[PDB]
Amino acid sequence: MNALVGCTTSFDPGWEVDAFGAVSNLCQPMEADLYGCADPCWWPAQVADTLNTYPNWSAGADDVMQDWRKLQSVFPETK
Amino acid sequence: VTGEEVLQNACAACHVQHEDGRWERIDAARKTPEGWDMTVTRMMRNHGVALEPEERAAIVRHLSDTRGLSLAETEERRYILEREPVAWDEGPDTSMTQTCGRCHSYARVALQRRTPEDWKHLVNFHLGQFPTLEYQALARDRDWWGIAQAEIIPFLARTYPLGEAPDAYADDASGAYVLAGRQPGRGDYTGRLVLKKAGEDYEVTMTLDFADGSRSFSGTGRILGAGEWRATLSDGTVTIRQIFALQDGRFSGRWHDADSDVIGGRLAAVKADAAPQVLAVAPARLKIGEETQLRVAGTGLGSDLTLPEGVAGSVESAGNGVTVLKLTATGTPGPVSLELGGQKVDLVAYDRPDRISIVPDLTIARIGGNGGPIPKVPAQFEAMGWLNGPDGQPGTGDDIALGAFPASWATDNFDEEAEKMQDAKYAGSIDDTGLFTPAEAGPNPERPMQTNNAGNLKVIATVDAEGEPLSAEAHLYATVQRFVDAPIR
Amino acid sequence: RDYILAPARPDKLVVIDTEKMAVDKVITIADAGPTPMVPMVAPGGRIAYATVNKSESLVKIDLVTGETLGRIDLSTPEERVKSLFGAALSPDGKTLAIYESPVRLELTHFEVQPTRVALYDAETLSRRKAFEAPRQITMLAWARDGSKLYGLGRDLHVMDPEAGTLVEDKPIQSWEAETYAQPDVLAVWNQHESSGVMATPFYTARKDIDPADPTAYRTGLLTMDLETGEMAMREVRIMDVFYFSTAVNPAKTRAFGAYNVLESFDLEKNASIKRVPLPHSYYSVNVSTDGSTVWLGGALGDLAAYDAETLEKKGQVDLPGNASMSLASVRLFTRDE
Ligand code: HEM
Ligand code: HEM
Ligand code: NA
């Protein structure tokens, strides 16, 4: 994950890649593991941590499967 | 709006200014412009500090001009400032890599200088802001807090001491420059860069000339601290960003598409009126027995050409930062050198590469779009050619590079498990220039468990060089979106 | 009569009538976002407590009425306190055990404070005691006799709530070190009520087997019996998949693990019984009072019922608006007919 600059190396099971070096062990689908990663801020460098930093990040998207398009990137698009 | 102003009108509400003049925290650390930006963002975000667009830009700029790093202090870590897609990030040892480079790049750490006391506050900030930090992988397997205090903090303080901020860049950079560089996926280029001072900033226009055409972008730029050049230029609906280092009147660095930083280019630029100097030569290789056109970018190269034994040819044109040559090598495969305007130009003769490697050989792409606010993240690959070098070799640190060769691109499932899932079928496609475009984000009800259009893929490139047995592969993880991003990952 | 208390973002607790496979009551809580985390049901199935507000608070609520009977705010102006995943109501329903990971908020810096366990009188919701506790503890669970408070950290911490001290540490970190690699344990789900057994899968490897060889990695089961006070750690299969949590049946003869697959284990043989795939990722696992139904939850917004024997899906109950359960704990409680 050293070559994957910007991705996490905390594989629980991970975000960019699994602890197995694949993507099949990541949540299926990803939006099923989304809030599990956000609410406890398990990967604060990749997913908004609602535990402290971005408490209102998921507002209006209680139904993750249907409302995922509402979740914004906290980076207003820049380098 | 000035830095002093925001410092007194906004920062002083919480940050104390000692009789010494120094500010609490503010003066206990030095970092890059991007670093100060992220810090100011957090003040606004986490601690409700109201900042107008100009004030924000003002203190960020003021902090980068007074409390930045020297260019030498960013060495080895500029890849993170440039959003360079082909990079490798790690700490000085396993311990540091594991505890500090598992969430964000270790480069975010190495690009900062602080006092032992401030490094303490920073580590306290981490456990205080992200209390679950000590429960995650690589942390719950040890006494995180105990080790943070006994080993990590003393290491940071010892390894990245405050030191002293360098003197700001004082000089006028205005004028015309000649440039040369490369844009993976498209090719080499030459061009001009002109700066016109405007207050503390510079008006900037960069023109890129590829063999298939030219294009110009225009905007504003500025120099932060000792020599960090940052600029935003446009042309039509396209916007790019320059992240350069300015030293000795020469610009060096990377620019990228403002809407997709994986797409961009590397370059160097020097005053158009400078003494004889070679910036680059494209191509830098010669196919033995075949006459080829070569573009030597630089200043005052003129047409004085002195060719070595195995290469014959002439000068077809000169001036305006580029001298076009027309050579042909007939010796044996290997490194060849010549002189132009008294300047050395290095090439490599060959008939067929001994092997090709994919760059990057390990990378990612991210699903996006599909009605969402986060666009796809592509992956650019390139097939590089090589010569086994002097040792026999087939692949050791010895070798001779031949440069990027045109190739045929394809994707496939990385393994059996991936095939069963039909990853290559849903994860996206790679075009003929080696540019991989990912699939739509969101759950795909057509896949098992309605999983995302992600996949464990393999990228295979096949360059058509005669002699012929030539192919290579790369590992591509077509993965999910990231909802948190920042100037420095 | 079995019921399920499942949190639903951003501020709800849904009681499910397992018998009619339907929602029984939806309790809405004020200042609860982004989601309640650790819910607890008092004996009788009438009153419940739930950590809410980014785990910084906890509310007492009337499950039938739906009103909030009281609240506890753990954070103060100069100190932010997180309960994270540790909150447990004593078996006699009189005292609440709340874990506290705090950080002191100074003008321009943070000062990490020692972790604590705070005891509150349930009936009055008053803070009655607070003592320093080891860090990195996820779940807090009471001994069935209410004499000890256990904390799942780098080791199974045995605390005396009366004296407010750490009396014993049951090995985890160094379990069978001459044979296995340090156990990896990721446990955040409170779901031992039905069996009185707190269990979590753990991952390790045979030290005398090449680490490149996939058969080196083993999946183990950690069981902390809250009645007998005994903790057991044993390998149950060669690790080929990962499970987020596990629940033991009331008979203590079986444990069920889940994530992307549902697998049952024979605790008497310490070996796998059967495995079936799942429609989507799940986090939580609980077992009905009669040991016949296994319930999966978390991640999304639907509780799925499975036959404990065949692991065949019996049904599914959708929370209102499919509101996600995230990694919040899902608990099963009863009410005398
Ligand atoms: C004024 C816009 C301003 C600046 C500049 C500033 C800077 C700053 C730094 C460099 C730090 C240290 C962060 C680190 O550890 O790397 C820091 C920390 C805190 N600040 Fe600040 N700060 C500015 C303004 C303000 C204002 C107006 C407040 C109070 C509302 C404030 C508060 C804090 C706090 C608290 C911290 C420590 C926690 C953290 O986020 O690091 N700052 N600040
Ligand atoms: C290893 C103990 C470690 C170090 C060292 C470290 C440093 C560090 C710096 C210098 C910053 C920038 C802060 C500033 O204002 O200048 C920073 C920021 C973030 N970090 Fe970090 N960090 C270390 C470790 C970790 C770990 C293990 C995590 C993930 C749990 C993590 C996360 C973050 C995040 C998120 C930020 C950005 C915070 C913000 O500005 O909102 N770090 N880190
Ligand atoms: Na997860």
Helix/strand/coil (H, E, C) string of chain C? CEEEEEEECCCEEEEEECCCCEEEEEEECCCCCCCCCCEEECCCCCEEEEEECCCCEEEEEECCCCCEEEEEECCECCEEEECCCCEEECCCCCEEEEEEEEEEEECCEEEECCCEEEEEECCCCEEEEEEECCCCCCCEEECCCCCCEEEECCCEEEEECCCCEEEEEECCCCCCCCCECCCECCCCCCCCCCCCEEEEEEEEEECCCCCCCHHHEEEEEEEEECCCCCEEEEEEEECCCCEEEEEECCCCCEEEEEECEEEEEECCCCEEEEEEECCCCCCEEEECCCCCEEEEECECCEEEEEECCCCCEEEEEECHHHCCCECCCCEEEECCC
Question: How many whole angstroms separate alpha carbon C298 and alpha carbon C329?
Answer: 8
User: Which amino acid, one-letter code, is at C304?
Assistant: A
Å from CA of A37 to ligand 3 middle: 6
CATH code, domain with C34: 2.130.10.10
End-to-end Cα separation, chain C, in angstroms: 6
B441 with B374: CB under 8 angstroms?
yes
Return the ligand 2 atom nearest residue A53 CA.
41
Mark which of B274, B306, B326 sits at the end of a domain.
B274
Cβ neighbours, 10 Å, residue B98: 18
Atom of ligand 2 nearest to the CA of B31: 16
Give the range of the structural domain holding residue C218, as residue numbers without chain letter: 1-337
Say how many Å lie between the CA of residue B106 and the centre of ligand 2.
9
Q: For C175, phi and psi rounded to 5 degrees?
A: -60, 125
Q: Report helix angle B33-46 to B53-66, nearest 10.
A: 140
Output the six-digit token pair for B139. 């942390």
Three-point CA angle A34, A36, A40, nearest 5°: 120
How far does the centroid of ligand 2 lie from the alpha carbon of residue C197, in Å? 38
CA torsion B446-B449-B451-B457 (nearest 10°) is -90
Chain B contact for C110, CB < 8 A?
Answer: yes
Are B217 and B240 in contact, with CB atoms under 8 Å apart? yes
Is A1-79 a domain of CATH 4.10.940.10? yes
Residues B227 and B362 in one domain: no
Name which of B257, B252, B207 is nearest B232 in CA terms. B257
Beta bridge partners of B202: B197, B221
Number of folded domains that form chain B = 4
User: Quick check: CB of B380 below 6 Å from ligand 2?
Assistant: no
Q: Indicate if B163 and B54 belong to the same structural domain.
A: yes
Helix (H, G, I), strand (E, B) or coil at A65: helix
DSSP state of A21: S
- Touching A: C residues 229-268, CB under 8 Å: 241-242, 260
- Which residues pair with residue B189 across a beta bridge? B181
Select from C43, C47, C41 the least CA-distant residue to C69: C47
- The residue from B152, B168, B184 where one domain ends is B168
Q: Domain ranges in chain A?
A: 1-79
Phi, psi of B440 (to 5 degrees): -65, 145
User: Is B486 inside a domain boundary?
Assistant: no
The two three-digit tokens of residue B415, written as one number: 């393994």
| Amino acid symbol at C256 | F
Residue C111 with chain B: CB contacts under 8 Å = 124, 128
- B286 touches ligand 2 (CB under 6 Å): no
SS3 assignment for chain B: CCHHHHHHHCHHHCCCECCCCCECCHHHEEECHHHHHHHHHHHHHHCCCCCCHHHHHHHHHHHHHHCCCCHHHHCCCCHHHHCCCCCCCCCCCHHHHHHHCCCCCCHHHHCEEECHHHHHHHHHHHHHHCHHHHHCCCCCCCCHHHHHHHHHHHHHHHHCECCCCCCCCCCCCCEEEEEEEEECCCEEEEEEEEEEEECCEEEEEEEEEECCEEEEEEEEEEEECCCEEEEEEEECCEEEEEEEEEECCEEEEEEEECCEEEEEEEEEEEECCCCCEEEEEECCEEECCCCEEEEEEEECCCCCEECCCCEEEEEEECCCCEEEEEEEECCCCEEEEEEECCEEEEEEEECCCCEEEEECCEEEEECECCCCCCCCECEECEEEEEECCCCCCCCCCCCEEEEEECCEEEEEECCHHHHHHCHHHHCEEECCCCEEEECECCECCCCHHHCECCEEEEEEEECCCCCCCCCEEEEEEEECCCCCCCCCC
Nearest to C107 among B14, B127, B134 (CB): B14
Q: How far apart are CA C137 and CA C149, in angstroms?
A: 12
Mutate to test the interface with B, among A1, A24, A74, A79 (most CBs of B within 10 A): A79
Is residue B244 assigned to a domain? Answer: yes
* Ligand 3 centroid distance, CA of B24 (Å): 39
Q: How many domains does chain C have?
A: 1
Pairing between strand B362-366 and B472-479? parallel
Chain-chain contact of B131 with C82 (C-beta, under 8 angstroms): yes
Which residue, B208, B241, B274, sits at the end of a domain? B274
Ligand 2 atom 9: the closest Cα is on which residue? B109
Residue B371 lies in a domain: yes
- Same domain for B243 and B306, yes or no, is no
Q: Which residues pair with B267 in a beta bridge?
A: B181, B253
Phi/psi of residue B195, nearest 5 degrees: -115, 140
Ligand 1 atom having least distance to the Cα of B42 = 40
Residue B476 near residue B379 (C-beta atoms within 8 A): yes
CA B64 to each of CA B56, B111, B247, C151: distance values in angstroms, whole numbers, following the listed order: 12, 13, 17, 47
Q: Are residues B280 and B188 in contact, defined by beta-carbon separation less than 8 angstroms?
A: yes
Instruction: Report yes or no: B126 and B109 within 8 Å, Cβ to Cβ.
Output: no
**What b/e readout covers A70-79, taking b as 16+ CB neighbours within 10 angstroms?**
bbbbbbeeeb
Cβ pairs B/C, distance under 8 A: 59
Assign A70 to helix, strand or coil.
helix
Ligand 1 mutation pick, B39, B54, B111, B120, max ligand atoms within 8 A of CB: B39
Angle at C54 between CA C51 and CA C59, to 5 degrees: 25
Per-position b or e across B391-427, b if 16+ CB within 10 A of its CB: eebeeeeebbebbbbebebebebbeeebeebebbebb
Going from the Cα of A47 to the center of ligand 3, the distance in angstroms, rounded, reads 11
Residue B398: domain span: 351-481
CA gap B224, C118 in Å, rounded: 50
CB C125 within 8 A of CB C60: yes
Do C260 and A28 make contact, defined as CB atoms within 8 angstroms? Answer: yes
The atom of ligand 2 lying closest to the CA of B36 is 16
Query: Which residue from C66, C61, C31, C37 is spatially nearest to C49, judged by alpha carbons?
Result: C61
CATH number, domain at B287? 2.60.40.10
Residues B334, B359, single domain; the answer is: no
Choose the closest CB to B102 out of A9, A30, A68. Answer: A9
Give the total residue count for chain B: 489
Please give the method by which this entry was determined: X-ray
Domain shared by B290 and B207, yes or no: no
Residue of B nearest to C84 (CA): B132
In angstroms, this model's resolution equals 2.0
Q: What is the DSSP letter of A71?
A: P
The protein residues having their C-beta less than 5 angstroms from ligand 3 (an ion) are A 33, 36
Separation CA C191–CA C200 (nearest Å): 10
Kindly identify which residue of chain B lies nearest to residue C174, measuring between CA atoms.
Answer: B141
* Structure tokens that stand for B393 in this block: 């070799």
**CA distance linking residue B464 with residue B426, whole number of Å:** 28
Domain annotation covers residue B488: no
Residue A33: active-site member:
yes
Residues B318 and B203 in one domain: no
* Partners of C127 in the β-ladder: C120
Geometric angle at alpha carbon C283, from C277 and C285, rounded to 5°: 80
Sheet of C156-160: strand order equals C140-142, C149-152, C156-160, C165-170
Q: Are B454 and B479 in contact (CB under 8 A)?
A: yes
Q: How many CA atoms lie within 13 A of C221 on its CB side?
A: 27
CA distance B112 to B28: 11
CA of C139 to nearest chain B CA: how many angstroms apart? 12
Chain A residues within 8 angstroms (CB to CB) of chain C: 12-13, 19, 25, 27-29, 32-33, 35-36, 38-40, 50-52, 55-59, 62-66
A61 interfaces chain B, CB cutoff of 8 Å = no
User: How far off is chain A from B94, nearest CA to CA, in Å?
Assistant: 12
Q: Are residues B146 and B8 in the same domain?
A: yes
How long is chain A? 79
Mark B248-275 as b/e (b = at least 16 C-beta within 10 Å): eebbbbbbbbbebbbbbbebbbbbbeee
